[PDB]
Scaffold this active site. Structure first.
Site, PDB file in Angstrom:
ATOM      1  N   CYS A 194       0.804  -1.222   0.000  1.00 34.67           N
ATOM      2  CA  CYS A 194       0.000   0.000   0.000  1.00 34.67           C
ATOM      3  C   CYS A 194       0.838   1.274   0.000  1.00 34.67           C
ATOM      4  O   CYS A 194       0.265   2.364  -0.029  1.00 34.67           O
ATOM      5  CB  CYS A 194      -0.966   0.051   1.194  1.00 34.67           C
ATOM      6  SG  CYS A 194      -2.078   1.462   1.241  1.00 34.67           S
ATOM      7  N   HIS A 217      -2.569  10.804   4.666  1.00 32.53           N
ATOM      8  CA  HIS A 217      -2.947   9.530   4.073  1.00 32.53           C
ATOM      9  C   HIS A 217      -4.462   9.402   4.005  1.00 32.53           C
ATOM     10  O   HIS A 217      -5.013   8.974   2.984  1.00 32.53           O
ATOM     11  CB  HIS A 217      -2.334   8.381   4.866  1.00 32.53           C
ATOM     12  CG  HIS A 217      -2.325   7.077   4.133  1.00 32.53           C
ATOM     13  ND1 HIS A 217      -2.855   5.921   4.662  1.00 32.53           N
ATOM     14  CD2 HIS A 217      -1.846   6.746   2.911  1.00 32.53           C
ATOM     15  CE1 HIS A 217      -2.706   4.935   3.797  1.00 32.53           C
ATOM     16  NE2 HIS A 217      -2.097   5.409   2.725  1.00 32.53           N
ATOM     17  N   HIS A 225      -9.195   4.824  -2.782  1.00 26.40           N
ATOM     18  CA  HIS A 225      -7.833   4.502  -2.357  1.00 26.40           C
ATOM     19  C   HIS A 225      -7.257   3.354  -3.169  1.00 26.40           C
ATOM     20  O   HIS A 225      -7.544   2.180  -2.877  1.00 26.40           O
ATOM     21  CB  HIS A 225      -7.803   4.159  -0.871  1.00 26.40           C
ATOM     22  CG  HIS A 225      -6.498   3.596  -0.408  1.00 26.40           C
ATOM     23  ND1 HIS A 225      -6.406   2.688   0.622  1.00 26.40           N
ATOM     24  CD2 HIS A 225      -5.231   3.820  -0.826  1.00 26.40           C
ATOM     25  CE1 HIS A 225      -5.141   2.370   0.815  1.00 26.40           C
ATOM     26  NE2 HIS A 225      -4.406   3.041  -0.051  1.00 26.40           N
TER      27      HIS A 225
END
Lengths: 1105, 67
Positions: A161, A293, A331
């Site tokens: 990620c 984030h 995301h």
């Protein structure tokens, strides 16, 4: 080390094809997470409905990248899109990819999925080998290295990620230490395999609502999204655009966390941020925006924002702007970092911070938002000016952080050359691409950096991009030109016209170019001592200025040398030189034999020597008679002068004989013409006296002879003695021979190779017709200059453009002053302006291609799609419709054949219902459907017990005649009354059926029950159940009868759609006819025959006592 | 600040464990994911440095050594 900057940038993201569309969607607030059913039927396995999904993955230009059609069908979609995105990223920076070939550039690609490999590697009896050559993770970077010829590291790293920013940091370390002069860094992600989403849901990360509510009170999780982005990072020297300079970047892992591996840490991230902005030498106050984030989890957001609060908010007074790009596009797991980077760069370019969606109430746990220290970008805000930081904290534990110093280079002040027109050469795969580039360039015709960068990337070979085009921006008579380059290199031949061409005020317009001015001024200095300057002659306004022979010679030679200098500036070395009359003197400069001063001296001395010698006026005429014919037809004292063409010839001599011959020719009527040569019969016997003094002078004028390259095709010396020693070198003897021997323009033309790109280096293209009618008809003639033109610079730039189209790579940039770089902030992006050859559709894995006979779970809960079944209650207990089984079997067969249900006209036969399935009020029942395509048979089972048995097969030859309504046995002419919906369902209630609203679909029915009108919603089960109800309505028997057997059912969706007719309301309807005589029920595209119903004993629940 | 560089060219365990959506468990990603080969080691040993999982086949291990 060396400064590192972000040169290029591009990619495709959710619901955005080019980054321009990405910005359009960001600034306008258009949500990018979609509920569509592209990848898989939303809800399958209960996965959250919404997800960011690219528009198309089945497009790829195989020819450009040299991938065979078979290989393209076995290539990961990530890889194809990444190749296109990387090409756009490199060219978006104004760097031609060929300029990087063979360099030490490195490729760090971030990726965390290889599902397509699992798709191509499931059946080992048919899987092909090259599936591994284009699907394995290593090949994601190695394919880029192979195509682009990058010799640097080719590493693909997962990082869980945080892959994109991890690769960015590794590339930054590579460039800083001098290892790599550049680096292509990308990040890819595609949602193809639902099992991954099921896993993420089980881990408790995905958000049920599907919206990543960053910083909000009610954040549940993050919504998976796709995206392919690449960025080119190069050292400051190679950079042509700089979105921002990477001040510093580093990584660290959270180590042992007590709560667990997936529980994010705050202290570690704070330490990373502090270390980065301490080592980078940047005070914390400089920051103006930090790209949190912002996943949306209840734990990640508080930790990350409190870390930022402790790291950056300690001392500064003004608030810190916090955003999260994942609140717009979802995301992407690996591509998360580069998506945020793209948003930051675009927001910097356009002057406004893109708003952050789905934020209405701040998280109470994050005190910064509640206070004023840390502020979110909920609505667009201008860029006041400051550094930025991007952080990506993967769920594994790897943390990355990047500090950026945005570029601030305001446009330069206006300059004199801005008014001058420029040239815009473009190349692309298809004409639409070149047209798009030209139109965009015209939109910003005043943006010098944009034009220069576009020009730089247009020098690509014809085979790669067969279509080209040149548009002259700034000129009044300027329009786009698009054409297909004929593949194959072509010669470039220069022809320097003769001394006859010279007009009033030539070259004043072109003086604006610096190179031309330098050439003409050097010539002026050369001519100084003799007492005249070329520039003064050009700017003079008297017509007699060019009347003087010597002035004509000097001016013509100077202008021709200037044109040569301009052409040479771009990098064109001719493959053949043919000169005419005084053109040979320029030909000397062309071939490097003669130096500029020598040429100018030759011209001046020829003019003066002709001036000194007193010879009676001699006209020069042209006779439309073949050369050999002119050998004899001419009278005494008339001689051939120049062999202009096969048809055209030039004759010179005394004025009296020339006039006599002109009269005679007019007697014959043949074409005759004569240019103005001031009575100086050039190339004739008159010049015989000229040479002696001329040779004596030219001996001193040209000191040392030099070789004549094989390119130069002389015209004074024929082919016979063409090997001569004197002809081996230019010298006074050479020019004397050129003046004495007649011109042989024709003989020179014969040796121009086929497909030659001729250039007419002359102030006026006097020899256009001669070349067109004399050379092989494949030759292209491109005259640089014309007479009396309003602006010769437009014409010259058009000539250079046509040179571009023919194939010769000529860059107009060199002609004008160099542009200051890095590019001014606000230069338009180039990635959106590149289009491909997407006429073909390549393969892509399907949802079924991964693990999952067919099992259908009938869930009757409120949210389930099968809720309508609760309205099908008989005897007070909800029973599965007898037509529900048929729909299940139909869907199974459609899946087997690969088609949809709407596209499959099916035929049932010998359907037998064995036991009735009661749908529990709370719970689910699993129906399993197995097919035997060989025997055309099917069997539905429930817990190992048979439920429905019969035959199902595709209807090979549908016949709409089957659905025509049979004539009713009863005319029913009166039709005074009919049964409405309420009445028909009252009757059915009295008989025992208790259908709810969903299964209430008989708008009207005749008294006999033989005809009616069935409402049509998208549900097939309801339609066929209503048909069965219409059948039951006319039955005289009492008590409720349920279907037990059906002999044959035909369905034809096309005829069904044809038969439906919209009512006066918005609702649609299909007429139904029941013929008990023929045992057929027909309605729309459905046709039931042989329906058998058996009385089912009442449940005798007698709930009423 | 010790880092962990593991070169791996196969995630075959994930394919086996993620075949049945009606029985697959979430822990499969934490354990069988390719990027967890480095992160698990860093988590166990308290290695605060970088954690990467390289994927250059046939040279991933020696490339990780070079890094």
């Amino acid at each position: 080390p060396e400064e590192v900057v972000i040169a290029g940038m591009s990619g495709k993201l959710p619901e955005s094809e080019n980054l321009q569309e990405f910005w359009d969607n960001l600034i306008g607030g258009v949500d990018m997470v979609t509920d569509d059913d592209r990848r898989w039927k939303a809800g399958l396995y209960g996965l959250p409905r919404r997800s960011g999904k690219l528009k198309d993955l089945s497009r790829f230009d195989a020819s450009f990248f040299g991938v065979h059609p078979k290989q393209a069908h076995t290539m990961d979609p990530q890889l194809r899109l990444l190749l296109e995105v990387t090409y756009e990223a490199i060219v978006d920076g104004g760097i031609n990819p060929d300029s990087l070939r063979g360099t030490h550039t490195g490729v760090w690609v971030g990726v965390s999925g290889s599902e397509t490999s699992e798709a191509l590697s499931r059946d080992p009896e048919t899987l092909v080998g090259y599936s591994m050559v284009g699907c394995q993770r290593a090949m994601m970077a190695n394919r880029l290295s192979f195509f682009f010829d990058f010799r640097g590291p080719s590493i693909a790293l997962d990082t869980a990620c945080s892959s994109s920013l991890m690769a960015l940091q590794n590339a930054y370390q590579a460039i800083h230490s001098g290892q790599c002069p550049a680096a292509i860094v990308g990040g890819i992600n595609v949602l193809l395999k639902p099992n991954t989403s099921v896993q993420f849901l089980r881990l408790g990360m995905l958000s049920p609502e599907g919206t990543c509510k960053a910083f909000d009170t009610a954040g549940n999780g993050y919504c998976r999204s796709e995206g392919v982005v690449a960025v080119l990072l190069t050292k400051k020297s190679l950079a042509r655009r700089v979105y921002a300079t990477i001040l510093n970047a580093g990584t660290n892992t959270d180590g042992f966390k007590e709560q667990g591996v997936t529980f994010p840490s705050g202290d570690i991230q704070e330490q990373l941020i502090r270390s980065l902005y301490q080592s980078a030498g940047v005070a914390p106050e400089s920051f103006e925006y930090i790209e949190a984030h912002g996943t949306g989890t209840k734990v990640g957001d508080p930790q990350e924002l409190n870390g930022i609060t402790r790291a950056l908010c300690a001392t500064r007074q003004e608030p810190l702007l916090i955003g999260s790009t994942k609140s717009n596009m979802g995301h992407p797991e690996p591509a998360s970092g580069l998506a945020a980077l793209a948003k930051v760069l675009l927001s910097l370019e356009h002057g406004l911070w893109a708003p952050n969606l789905h934020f209405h109430s701040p998280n109470p746990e994050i005190p910064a938002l509640l206070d004023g220290r840390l502020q979110v970008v909920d609505q667009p805000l201008p860029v006041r000016g400051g550094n930025v930081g991007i952080n990506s904290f993967g769920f594994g534990g790897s943390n990355v952080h990047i500090i950026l110093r945005p570029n601030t280079q305001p446009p330069p002040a206006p300059a004199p050359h801005a008014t001058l027109p420029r040239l815009l050469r473009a190349s692309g795969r298809t004409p639409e691409a070149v047209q798009k580039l030209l139109e965009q360039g015209l939109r910003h015709s005043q943006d010098l950096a944009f034009l220069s960068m576009l020009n730089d990337i247009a020098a690509v070979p014809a085979t790669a991009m067969p279509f080209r085009g040149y548009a002259v921006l700034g000129g009044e008579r300027g329009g786009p030109e698009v054409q297909q380059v004929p593949a194959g290199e072509r010669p470039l031949w220069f022809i320097c016209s003769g001394m006859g061409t010279q007009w009033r005020g030539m070259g004043l317009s072109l003086m604006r170019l610096d190179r031309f001015r330098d050439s003409i001024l050097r010539s002026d200095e050369a001519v100084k001592p003799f007492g005249l300057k070329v520039s003064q002659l050009l700017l003079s306004t008297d017509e007699s200025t060019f009347d003087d022979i010597v002035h004509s010679f000097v001016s013509l030679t100077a202008i021709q040398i200037g044109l040569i200098d301009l052409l040479s500036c771009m990098g064109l070395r001719p493959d053949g030189i043919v000169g005419h009359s005084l053109g040979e003197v320029a030909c000397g400069y062309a071939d490097g034999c003669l130096s500029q001063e020598e040429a100018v001296l030759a011209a001046y001395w020829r003019g003066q020597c002709i001036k000194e010698a007193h010879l009676p006026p001699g006209a020069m005429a042209a006779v439309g008679l073949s050369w050999e014919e002119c050998k004899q037809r001419c009278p005494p004292g008339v001689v051939p002068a120049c062999h202009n063409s096969k048809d055209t010839v030039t004759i010179s001599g005394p004025q009296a004989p020339v006039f006599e011959f002109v009269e005679q020719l007019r007697k014959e009527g043949v074409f005759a013409k004569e240019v103005r040569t001031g009575g100086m019969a050039f190339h004739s016997y008159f010049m015989e006296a000229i040479a002696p003094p001329l040779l004596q002078e030219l001996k001193k004028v040209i000191r040392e002879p030099k070789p004549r390259s094989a390119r130069w095709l002389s015209t004074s010396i024929p082919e016979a003695q063409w090997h001569s020693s004197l002809a081996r070198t230019s010298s006074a003897e050479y020019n004397v021979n050129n003046l004495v021997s007649p011109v042989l323009f024709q003989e020179a033309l014969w040796h121009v190779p086929e497909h030659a790109v001729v250039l007419e280096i002359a102030p006026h293209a006097l020899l256009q017709a001669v070349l067109k009618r004399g050379l092989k008809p494949s030759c292209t003639i491109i005259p640089l200059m014309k007479k009396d033109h309003r602006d010769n610079l437009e014409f010259f730039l058009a000539g250079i453009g046509r040179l571009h189209l023919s194939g010769i790579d000529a860059n107009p940039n060199a002609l004008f002053p160099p542009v200051e770089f890095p590019a001014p902030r606000g230069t338009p992006l180039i990635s959106p302006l590149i289009k491909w050859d997407h006429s073909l559709a390549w393969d892509v894995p399907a949802a079924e291609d991964f693990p999952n006979a067919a099992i259908y779970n009938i869930d009757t809960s409120s949210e389930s799609p099968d809720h309508y079944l609760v309205d099908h209650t008989l005897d007070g207990r909800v029973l599965f419709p007898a037509t529900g089984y048929l729909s299940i079997v139909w869907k199974t067969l459609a899946r087997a054949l690969g088609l949809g249900v709407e596209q499959l006209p099916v035929v049932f036969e010998d359907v037998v219902l064995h036991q009735a399935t009661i749908l529990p009020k709370t719970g689910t029942v699993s129906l399993e459907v197995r097919l035997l395509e060989a025997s055309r048979a099917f069997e539905v089972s429930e817990n190992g017990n048979l439920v429905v048995s019969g035959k199902v097969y595709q209807w090979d030859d549908p016949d709409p005649r089957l659905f025509d309504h049979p004539e009713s046995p009863t005319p029913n002419p009166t039709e005074p009354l009919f049964l409405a919906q309420a009445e028909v369902y009252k009757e059915l209630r009295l008989r025992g059926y208790d259908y709810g609203p969903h299964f209430q679909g008989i708008l009207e029915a005749s008294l006999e029950g033989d005809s009616g009108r069935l409402l049509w919603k998208d549900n097939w089960v309801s339609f066929m159940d209503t048909m069965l109800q219409m059948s039951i309505l006319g039955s005289a028997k009492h008590g409720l009868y349920l279907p037990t057997r059906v002999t044959a059912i035909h369905i034809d969706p096309a005829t069904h759609r044809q038969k439906l007719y919209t009512l006066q309301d918005k609702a649609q309807v299909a007429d139904v006819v029941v013929s008990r005589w023929l045992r057929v029920t027909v309605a729309g595209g459905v046709h039931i025959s042989g329906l058998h119903t058996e009385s089912a004993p009442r449940r005798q629940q007698e709930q009423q006592v």
